Amino acid sequence: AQQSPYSAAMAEQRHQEWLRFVDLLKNAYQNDLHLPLLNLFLLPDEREALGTRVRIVEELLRGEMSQRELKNELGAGIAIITRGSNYLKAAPVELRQWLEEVLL
Template identity: 40%
Template sequence: MINELFRKIANEDDISLILPLLLSAEELNAVNARTLVYKELLLAEKSQREIAKTHGISIATITRGSNNLKSMSDKEKKLLQTLLIGK
């Protein structure tokens, strides 16, 4: 259902409107934090501790993100890299 919904969204403004309707503020913050963690880990410019300190994200959250990245397929990692970094 969610895939179908997002396929119908025409522009970025509509995404900004629909996400708070589907997710609580806490859930949105968690998704934003995870996205930031993935981006930082993919950039590989900072240690996990530096990421935690810079962004105020717990080391446990960063470790979970790192473990998730390790379990992703190459295709999934490439998609994230393209979407988050542009490479």
Template identity: 40%
Template sequence: MINALLRDISSEEDISIVLPLLLSCEELNAINARALIYKELLLAEISQREIAKKHNISIATITRGSNNLKSMSDKEKKLLQTLLIRK
């Protein structure tokens, strides 16, 4: 159901309206933090401790993100790179 809903959203403005209706503030913050962690880890420019300090995120949260990233398939990692690192 959520896949169909998100697929039907046609604008960034609509996404900004719908996501807060579906997710609490804490959930949105957690998703944003996870995306930020994945981006920093995929860039591999700074250490996990530096990521934690730079973005005020606990090292435990970054470690969980790192472990999730390690368990992803190459296809999943490539998709994240495409979506998060827009070069």
């Protein structure tokens, strides 16, 4: 299923729309408007999920909590641990090194 000019054109547009959000948020942090901006663009349950994903990443990096603890404390089952681990492994090395410094 190789990509066509139609599919490539749509994918480029979606990427530019994502970058426009990223840039809006960047400027909101510089204006101290990021809290209401994130409340406008993210639903309550989405904000809750992001806060939980940070805890999962933190605990996976620390390597102390067992899988049972991850489930009971964070609601994180084996599937989400596996995905979370894959995303950590796929991260650029500069990000992983920075997350170990900030979260730990």
